[PDB]
Structures are given as C-alpha cells and as structure tokens.
Design a protein around this nucleic acid. Structure first.
Lengths: 148, 117, 141, 58
RNA sequence: GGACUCGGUGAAAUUGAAUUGGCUGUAAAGAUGCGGCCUACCCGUAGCAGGACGAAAAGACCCCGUGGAGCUUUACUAUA
RNA sequence: AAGCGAGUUGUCUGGUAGGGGAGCGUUCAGUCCGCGGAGAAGCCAUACCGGAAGGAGUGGUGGAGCCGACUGAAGUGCGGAUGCCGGCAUGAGUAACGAUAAAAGAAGUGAGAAUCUUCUUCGCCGUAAGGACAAGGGUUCCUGGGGAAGGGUCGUCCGCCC
RNA sequence: GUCCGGGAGUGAGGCUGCGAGAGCUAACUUCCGUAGCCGAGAGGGAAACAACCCAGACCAUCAGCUAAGGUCCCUAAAUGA
RNA sequence: UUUAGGAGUGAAAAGCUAACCGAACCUGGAGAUAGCUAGUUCUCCCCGAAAUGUAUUGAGGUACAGCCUCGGAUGUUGACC
RNA sequence: GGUCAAGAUAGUAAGGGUCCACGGUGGAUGCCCUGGCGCUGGAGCCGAUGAAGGACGCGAUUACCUGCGAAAAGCCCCGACGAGCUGGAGAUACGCUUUGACUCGGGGAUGUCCGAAUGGGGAAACCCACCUCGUAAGAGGUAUCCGCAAGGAUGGGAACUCAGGGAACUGAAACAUCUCAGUACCUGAAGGAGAAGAAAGAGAAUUCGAUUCCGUUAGUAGCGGCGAGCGAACCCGGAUCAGCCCAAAUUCAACCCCUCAAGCCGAAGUGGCUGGAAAGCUACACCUCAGAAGGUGAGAGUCCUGUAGGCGAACGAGCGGUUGACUGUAAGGUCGUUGUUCGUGAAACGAUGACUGAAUCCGCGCGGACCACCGCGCAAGGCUAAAUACUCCCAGUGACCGAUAGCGCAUAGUACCGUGAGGGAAAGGUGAAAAGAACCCCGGGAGGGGAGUGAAAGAGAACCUGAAACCGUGGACUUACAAGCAGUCAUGGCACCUUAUGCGUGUUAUGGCGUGCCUAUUGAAGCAUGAGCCGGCGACUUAGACCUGACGUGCGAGCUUAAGUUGAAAAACGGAGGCGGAGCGAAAGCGAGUCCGAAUAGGGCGGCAUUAGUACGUCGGGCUAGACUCGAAACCAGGUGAGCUA
C-alpha cells in the first residue's frame, strides 16, 4: 500500500541489515499485508423457514399481547396526542414496548426514539421485529394474520 | 477489531511477581531478575515440601542410632527388636516425640532386647 | 427492582446443541514448527502430492463429447395408480421435460396394472414393459 | 579496528563498593589562630588575616 | 608530550546473568557455577596480557544449494 | 427444559508432529430496569476461591462513565523475531580539549575574573597562516545589546539570539 | 482376531547385549538386524555423568517396608560372629 | 562541453561512470523465490513415533506403508500355555 | 571486691544488601470536535475577453497560510443577512453602526516572472530592437499549425476504452514452445464518455435480428517439453427488447416539472442535597408526521443549531416541456505468420510479406480442410445515447483506527539526504474558562518564596492520570573471614504482634546439594546459538457453489443464480442450472443387469441381510493467490547528473 522506492543499503554488511526495500509488518508507519478487504456479506438463508420460524417465535411468546384492530375509532383525523393516549385503556404508555404494523402511511409515523419504540412499516411480517416489542400486535384489517 | 494492550500487560508481570521476596539487589521490582529468577524459583519448588523428608531424615539416624548406649543399643541391627513387640507398626514422628521424655526406653529396652528366646 | 438478579428479558435462551469447532489460523499459539516450510503451505498451486505420473502410459481413449447418456424414471411407482401428469411435456419434476437428449424406456416386466404416457421412446430395455403398462408405439426420431 | 567489545556489564552489586577507598578524606581539623575560624592546612585567615601576626586584609 | 593533583564535557563497537580462585578429573573430552580437594581480610587505582572458545559481517578458503552474476569454447541453440 | 455420578477396580502413564476437550479477558454488537459522587472507570497493594490462566476483600489516587449475564464477531495475549523507532543505558568518569607554531601583568568592568578591554615588554608566519579578483555560503560588517543553547571547560567575546 | 477415513512426524541417531562385514577382531569409525535405553519422564548405585543392578509416579503427610547400594567418619546404616 | 548503461573512458587492471560496477543510480516490473533459515503470541485434561523399505537429475528434499488420535466395525477369528 | 588468665564472644561496617516512604528527561491505558478506511446519491475542468501551480508581493510587523501584487483581505449590480471591526504574534491601537460599515450568493475586473505565454536572452523572479503616442519624458506590440488574406487551435492533469505498445524474477520443483501477456514504460485522442454495438450474423427441430457486463453452463470442447496450464458456442436476467449513414438536423429565446451556494422561521416546566449549576434520588404538565451527532464547568425535549412544513431575487447552468428566428427526407488464395480457447497443425474465420482485382445474382460468404445437399447473409462507410466498467468534488451514510495508532500530512511530507532524478521526519491533549498571575527575598538570569487567581493549580505558563530496567535517601534486620551465576526448603537470627491464643507477619549466618531460558539441535547444563531493559508490531489467513468431513436442522422424491417489483430487513415470484442419479462400456450403445464371442464361468452394477438424499454454519486436510512475513548480491522500462579518476 505504501508505494515507495526499491533497492536498499548494504543488505549484507555492517550490522545484519535485513534490508532490501520495505515489505514487512516491521517498520512502523505502514500496513501489514493481507487482511480485511471491503467484503459484501454473502449468505442466502433458507427461504423455507420464515413463514413458520416466525410462528415458532410464538412458541411461549403466545402470552405476548396480540389482537385485531384499526388505528383508532374514538378519534377523528390524525394529530397523535390522545390517539396514542388511548393506549392507556390497557396500560400501554410505559409498561412494555408495543409492536406496530398497520396499513396506512399517512398516519403511522410519529414515534421515533432512542430507547422507546421503533416503527418501520411495509404492512407485512418481519423477524427483525418479532421480539423487539414484547407484545406482538399486527392487526390492520388489510394485511392481518393472513398466511398470504 | 482492535485491542491495544499497552496497559493490560502489567498485571500479568505482577500476577507472578508475587514472589518478589528477598532475592538480590532489587529483585522485587526488577524486570529481568524477576521473570527469570521466578523461572529460577521454578524448579524443585514444586516438590520442596515433600522431598524435604530426605532432609529431616538426616535427623533420626544420629539420635535413633545410639543415644543412651548405657543400655545396649544398635538401632540398625535392633529394628528387629522394634517389630518384636505385640503390635509395633508405627515408627517415626514418635522419634520426634522421643525428643521429650527420656523414659521412652526404660522398660522399653529389655522388652525387645532379648525378645527372641 | 434490580436487587438480586441479572437479566430481565429472555434471549438468554441458550440452545440444545452445537455447530462450530475449534478452528485454527495456521502458525499459531506461539509454538509449533508445524508442517514443512519448504514450498508447502504458502502458494504451492500445483497439488500437494507427487506430479503428473501414472497418468501417462495409457494409449488414451477419445470420445467424451456430450452426445447422450440419458437418466431413468426408476420404473416402480408409475405404472400402478398413476393416471395423468406424465406426458413428455408436463413431466418436469426430475428433469424430464428437458427435450433434445432422449429418455429411452427401461422398465421391468410382469405388470399387473396399466397407465398412459406421451412416450416418445422405444428402447429395448423396457421390452418386458412397453405395452403391459400401456401406451401406443409411435416412433419419433 | 575494534578490541573485544563490552558484552558483560557492571551495573549494581558492584559500583557500590567504590565510594570508600577514596570518597573524600573527611576533614574539620583546625579553626584559625585566634579570631573566628578558617585556617586551612597551615594557612592564614582572610578574616583577621593572621597565623599570629600581621598579614592579609579584611 | 601522554601514565598521577583539579575544574567541564565523556560517546561509540557490544552484551543473559557474576558471592569472576585453582587443581586434577569429568563433560559432544578447551569446565572458573560439575565432581573431590586446597585456599583468600574486603575494597580502590596504576600497569600487564594467559583468559572468557577476544570483538566485527551468521568464513565470502571449501562442500552442500536442480543460487546469481561475470568470461571464454565448435558446449544445445537463437540472433543483428 | 442444554445430561450428570458418588459406592468400586484396572487405567488416571510424564510427554516431543498430533487427536477429543475447558476456559481468563479486552475490543464490536443485543437487551440496558442498569452499575458510579459515599465518585466507578487509570492505577498501587493485603495468607478467599479457582485444573492453570485468573475471578475476590480495601484503600490509595484519579477524574469523568462503565461494563454484565445467554450471544456472535476481532489486527484475542511470547520479555524474548541478534528485529525497528522512542527513552533509560553502561564502556566512567578514566583516553581525550585538536596539529607542543612560548607568555607575564598593570589597568577597564563587575557577579567573582586566567584566557575581553587602554597597553610596555615575547615569539610563530610573513611566496604566509597578507590584501584584491574566481566558486561558494547569503548574512557576513556594524550602533550595540541577554546566557536558555551552541563555540566539545566556561566566561560579562560571536559573525548565537534583537 | 476385524477394515474406510480428517489429519502426523521428519528421515540425517547412540549405546550395552547378539555376530559378521572395511579392520594391526582397533575406533561413543563405519553396514546390518534383534531387547532396552536417551530424540518424548526424576533417583539410589554409579564421586556428579543418555542405554548399567533396582525402579517409571493424581496433588498433598517431617507414617511403614522392600532392591540396589551400605553397616568408621565428612552426610544413613553391626570394625557382629 | 558532447560521450551513458549494457555504451563510453581507458597506459589493458578486466581498472571507472560520481567513495564497491564481474555491466551506475533513482521511481517503477514481483516480495527473485525459496524445499535455506530466525521466529510464528495466555493458561490446558486422557493417548502417541520413524534416520526401517520401496521412489527420485533423489538424498539432513519430498511420497507412501508398518508406526498416533478419533467415527463406524470386526456376535467368537485373539495372543500365552 | 580485687591480682592473673584464657575460654565465650559482643557494637561500629567507610560503602552495600532483604522491606517501605518520597522521585526523574521518558511514558501507555481510560479518553478527545477536526486527521485516516470501505460507501450510497448526484455532480463531473477553464481553454490568446489565456489554465494547474509556484516565485518574489498589502494592513503603523509580515515570515508558514485567507484574498488578492499594486484598484493585493478586496470593487458594478441584484441579494442574503447583519449593523458592528477585517485569518494563525487570537495582534493593543487605529477606524467605520443602526436607508447598507461587517460576512457574502452570482453573471463581470485590476491580474506581476514562469506555464502554450511565444518579441528577442532565455540558467521562474532578469538584459535588446523596431512602429503607432508626443508639453524636452514616454504611451499602443511583435510565435507555429489548418478553410489561408484575418482568424481558430496546441496547456497542465490523480482512476474510465483502444491504439503505436512490450520485456521480465517466477512455475513446470532446474531447464529456449509456455504461465505472467500483452503486464511495467513510452507515446495519440475527446467527453467526462469514448470503445464493440443495425451485419457477406449466432443457432440448429425444417430457429433467432441491433454491443457489453455479470447471473448459470462450461469451470465442458480444445489446447498442450500432450506438462502446470488457458478456456467459447449449445438453454438462461436486466439495463436494452428503437432508426439511419459516402456516387443512381443544428443554432439565439419566452415560458419550466427542476436543480446551485449568503440565507428565513422550526417545537414543548422547575425546585432541594453530596456538590462545579447534577439531566442521579423526587415530583407533576406540556411538544409529537418533525424526539440522529453536538456546545455552554456534573449524560438537558421546555438555551440552541438539525429533522417534519415549506420559501429566495439579480447571473447562469442544469434533466427540460409548446413554440419564434432554421427548411427534419443521398476482397477469397498460396508460402511465411499475429489473434481468436486453440503453443499453429488432422481444420474454414481478423489480417500482412510478393504475387492474383475473379465473381459480377437463382452469381456470390461460410457451417469448423473437401464431396453432395441445406441454412443464412451479400462488395461497398459510419451514427446509435440507456445499462457494463470509472471515481477529482457537494450532502449523507459504516459490528474501524486513534494522533511512531491511521496515508508520510489531526496544519511539516520544516530543515533537508544530496552526485542526480529521487528518500524523509519525529511530534498531538490545561480546566468549561486561563483568569497563563500586582505585591518584599538569593540571583546576572534561568529556577525557586509569600498570596489572590484556582469549586478542584500533588492542571500548573514544553501542562491529565502517570506503571518501569537504570536512577534519589533513610531506616527495623543481617554481612567481609566467607567463597559458586541462581535456586527451594531448612533450626537459628532483628523486627510485628489489621484476632495473650509459646501462634506470624519484613528476613539471614548457614545446610542438600543443586548449572540458566529461548530454542535450528540424535545429542549438553554448557563455551552451541539469540538475548541490557523498557513500550508495540508478533503472520497458513482473507473472497472464492475451490472440496472432503463432526454436529444441529431442511426436506425423502431434494436443494437454487442472475436482481425485477418492494426497499432503514425482507420477500415470496424464479427449474439458467448442476449435484444426487442403475450401471457398464473407448464409446457407440447397451441395459435393470454387464465388457468377452462362438459366451452358468468371471471383476463391477440396478443390485444389495438397500440411506436414493441434499442444503447453511463454524469447523480435519487440501486449493485458485505473495496471501505465514521478512534477508540477499541479479534480469528490465524509464528517467539523473559525469563539477569523481578520464
């Protein structure tokens, strides 16, 4: 990587030169030759175990809260305030983590934190978010538990 | 990646420097005459609490040899007098005890001396 | 809370088996001469054995081009209760529908039942089976 | 041209017992003829400037 | 004029480590820490070479090395 | 719900290339309710336990964070490669101050003055170790000024430095 | 008694016994095989000292005996017959 | 001040090209590659060797086999008497 | 008590050692906004109305840098926004304010020697002629190429295509065909796109059109000192599945979905302690499509810059949409050989060295030489944007480093090494903030006192914490009459008793004796070698369906690539496709059985007292690569002085 001259002092004289250019991880100020090249991560993961492996994450996680719903009915348009506050009719505003899915992208983006909840929706399933929020609650009346 | 162990390799040298005893000059915080002198303190040190019997063996073979010769005594050609009582068995340590009461061979002389016929 | 424990949400669930081993990095642990430094280990490129001997000697027999080798349909669980999904077009489950290179016949004998096939074959193997199972003659090419 | 190099050294152990066969002679012997106290090894003040009579000067 | 009184500066080649005397013997036989024996009050500096298998580049005299370079001969052969 | 043995007999040998096998812990990442101001992390030392490696008791000091169990990743660990740099070294206070082509002193100064300065005496070169032109250094020359350092003593002298 | 496989080693030893080979039966010289030994473990005996007489170990006890070696001493053990 | 690298200079020594030219230096082609050889890092529980033979422009090079560990196995085939 | 006496043996130890306290120039960890690596998405040079970058150039000083050199920190204008002061010796001062000082967004300008610069000289900062001007002084400028009579162009470039381009250490265990390959280097071109790309074509069932890339095959056919080895077409994806060129479109502009810097607002409460206001203990509401990094002495949503909501002109590009000033349809071949996968020979096909310019249309080019029949294409010149492959800049983004770590640069590639192109450092850090400090002392001063500063000055004006060989002193203890680098225990010996508990802590005359470690060694303990120490670097691994195999799992009829759609995960969709699969046989082909020929007797197989499996991961060895690193003199391309000897 250094890219420098060639040739050297008296490789075989004076005091054991051990010279001849600089191609070893000895001299301080260069590299070490061979090691971590960029890498692009090459794995496929079996495409079978996915629409059931998830079901297996419901083995004893069944206790996890789950149900059927549509955003909110006891509200009007969208403005996130007493809408999320509705999540008090069960102690869901500081006791767990809350899973989120839905099918709307117009009112499903108003809760991004560092330690609180997560949010990324695509209206489907995701192992990436199946333990993240302790009470798994999908429910959308559009893309619910459908095996589809 | 990365580690930088330019501080962790201190307690290592010390975890063995435990034996910084009275060696020589300053072989207690040396860094030469430590992790070497330790390799010196790495010999029969392992067997320096068992093999020692040989050293203290060089005790009762001067006392047990022929102490009160005013009897008969022989020790060597007399051990067949020891194991000539009813249930002799035991031997040393009782030699270490022999250093106390001198009457450890009063009526324990000719009570094995001619215990043949 | 947090008095005398350590966790608070499973994931700590270990497993019931293993998979990896011990691994090695070659030239390790601060010891071992290991293997022979003379050429081997590094590069080498040519195999780690002798050379190109006992390869020579034979007079060599050509003819290795693709031509044709066929496979088989095993013949055992097809001429019984099997009805219709084995023509020379829909049969593509164990690489059959792949045209061009023939599939001959090759079947046993006796036969206590029958079926139907879009055959396109007339091998001399399944001569003891080519009608017993059933299904025309029709030679193609 | 080099004559047998250093090799072996002589740090501690030795280099200790070398400040005794010389050191400094240790003195404090005399303290001037009469007034104050200088004198040296037989040699007049600069104080009163004298071993017993007129000499030197304050 | 240098070796000795005194003021300042004082490095390099090198090197595991010195409670660093010897014999005769022993050891891959050239042992001072080994054997067995004898022996010195410890230290400083001047001076001397037997001494550490003296120092320096891992002999370059040589051999091993399916090493290199260099010159020559009709060596196999390219070639202006 | 990941497999575990006393009761016992032989083996439990010591092991160089090797086989099956356990870990101490640091950096990256998961969950961080967290652990720290009485202050943890940086470090210095005290006879609990551990198969070894190491984990433990407390202050000291230090100044803002830091690691944990279930987990995977990482340039995961010789003092030791006559290595390389950075620093301390010792040869050691000896050999040496430079071509052995003499110098004493009065006095200026001031911090003391032997090598500055005003100067009578001495001597070496003077086809020189003169002065100008040639190359060079570029700041030499001055009005002079201060020691941190250098001029291999140092100094109140430099053409050091302004 | 009984093979298939992931992977070794590094090919250049020494000695006493067993007998010859080159040999003034000379040589920890050299060739060979056969037990052991040291290349991978310590001792007593052997003055200490790889194959020699006895003996190869789990860590700890200042508990016992056997073989060699010794029964005058420097450091064990009857100048007992 | 042109000559220069595989050329010139040259009193021939096989001397020199800028303190080593057996064919300059520097940036660059590849690290000449290496059976040579220095080394290749923390602490371990049970097992274990070859310098014998065959191969070699082949020898302290290397291949394999008896020779080690492990998965499976060998329902009577072990060695001693 | 005493005369004498030896015996017994006692302290000091100049100096040192076992142990602690107090310590250095040096200094790592914990740790720090810029400084390094891999990257997404865009953008992607100016060009005699002359560029990269240097030289010498202004502020009451100017030297390393901002701009600019004399109209040198900057000017027309519109405009942001601000109203105060122009970058490090932050520069005291000097000076300007709230209808434009202060910083600036874009279209312009004074623009010094060199760069193409080119008047001449021609060794960057420097010397000359000759014509226009003109109060006696001095002002306008001088160089080659192509339509030629002006002018237009050539400059320097870090990675993208070819072309003139061409060796070579290595391997084959050495070793001229060869692998490296057409690679190092030289030279020519333009855009940031050129290069192949619409044809005398690939395929092969009696099909299919424009290049390339990767996906799968084929890692097959071939090649080949027949050796390592290089390696298409047959079936596959998308970006793209779009027209025309030599002899019968482009140019100024209005409007524009739309980009480019100055810039506009942008959310929502606080008290008490150990203490530096604690965001830690506690308490309650408000802000929500916007709750990534960060500064202000202790991690803050109610102190603030982003994020969601959206704006900005004068100048211009930039990806443009209807249209105005233009007119959008005139050669095979032989012989010698380079390539191609084809080392060239059992083979057409690119083309060259001298020879043949035939065919001339149901004539002509080939299917790997030729015969016969088919298939397709026709001398004759180019354009084709889109993806494939690139990485100077502008936001943003990653299980990295940490200022000998990382590029050598966290403001140096300073000085320079110097014979020449050409080689180069080492080095960071005080707390939020210097408040980096008046006031009496020794002294020349450096350096040190008081005492504030300082929340905290064992930070400390060459500065965090601050371990260490060497190095600074004393002390409880022993020691010169005792012998071996060292050892461990061993009775004693002075000390201490963080638990009277005849028990221990800091230790030593001396005793058994006893020879170091690394580590290439049959082999030693060696004088066999490596080693003064400290701090780090400390290597068979990394990508590769390269493969075999343990375990867990997927399936028993099994498992997927290429990216197309989603897109801060995905993913099903996907049989390109290969491996397993009856086999044997040179293969053909054969066949559940098989090569022999004159064929119950034999080796392998479906078979079989039978796994027919396969994919992911860490992993046994190996593999394509230097890929365990380093140490060799020698071969080469280019380039540099010969002021050394000549």
């Amino acid at each position: 990587v250094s890219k420098t001259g060639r040739k050297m002092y008296g490789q075989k004289g004076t005091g054991n030169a051990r010279h001849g250019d600089r191609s070893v991880p000895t001299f301080v100020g260069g590299g070490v030759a061979f090691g971590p090249k960029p890498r692009s991560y090459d794995y496929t993961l079996p495409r079978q175990v996915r629409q059931l492996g998830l079901a297996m994450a419901i083995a004893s996680r069944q206790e996890g809260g789950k149900l059927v719903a549509v955003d909110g009915f006891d509200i009007a348009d969208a403005k996130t305030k007493n809408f999320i506050s509705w999540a008090k009719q069960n102690g869901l505003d500081g006791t767990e983590k809350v899973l989120l899915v839905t099918d709307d992208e117009n009112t499903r983006r108003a809760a991004r934190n560092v330690s609180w909840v997560s949010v990324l929706p695509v209206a489907g399933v995701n192992v990436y978010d199946i333990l993240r929020h302790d009470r798994l609650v999908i429910d959308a009346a559009a893309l619910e538990i459908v095996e589809e | 990646p990365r580690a930088k162990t330019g501080i962790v390799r201190r307690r290592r040298h010390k975890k063995v420097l435990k034996r910084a005893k009275g060696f020589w000059g300053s072989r207690s915080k040396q860094y030469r005459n430590a992790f070497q002198t330790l390799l010196n303190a790495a010999t029969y040190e392992y067997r320096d609490r068992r093999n020692k019997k040989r050293d203290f063996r060089r005790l009762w073979i001067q006392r047990i040899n022929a102490g009160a010769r005013l009897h008969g005594m022989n020790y060597s050609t007399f051990i067949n007098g020891l194991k000539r009582a009813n249930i002799d068995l035991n031997r040393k340590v009782l030699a270490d005890i022999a250093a106390r009461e001198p009457e450890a061979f009063k009526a324990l002389v000719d009570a094995s001396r001619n215990a043949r016929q | 809370h947090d008095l005398k424990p350590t966790p608070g949400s499973r994931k700590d669930r270990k497993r019931v088996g293993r998979g990896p081993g011990g691994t090695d990095k070659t030239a390790g642990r601060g010891h071992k001469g290991q293997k022979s430094r003379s050429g081997a280990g590094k590069g080498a490129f040519f195999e780690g054995g002798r050379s190109r001997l006992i390869a020579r000697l034979p007079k060599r027999g050509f003819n290795n081009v693709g031509t044709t080798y066929e496979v088989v349909k095993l013949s055992q669980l097809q001429d019984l209760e099997d009805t219709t999904f084995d023509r020379d077009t829909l049969e593509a489950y164990r690489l059959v529908r792949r045209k061009n290179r023939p599939v001959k016949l090759l079947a046993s004998g006796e036969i206590s039942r029958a079926v139907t096939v879009h055959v396109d074959a007339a091998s001399a193997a399944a001569i003891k089976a080519v009608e017993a199972a059933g299904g025309r003659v029709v030679l193609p090419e | 041209a080099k004559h047998p190099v250093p090799k072996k050294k002589t740090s501690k152990s030795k280099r200790d017992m070398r400040r005794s066969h010389h050191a400094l002679t240790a003195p404090n012997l005399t303290e001037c003829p009469q007034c104050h106290g200088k004198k040296l090894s037989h040699h007049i003040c600069p104080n009163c400037g004298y071993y017993d009579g007129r000499q030197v000067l304050a």
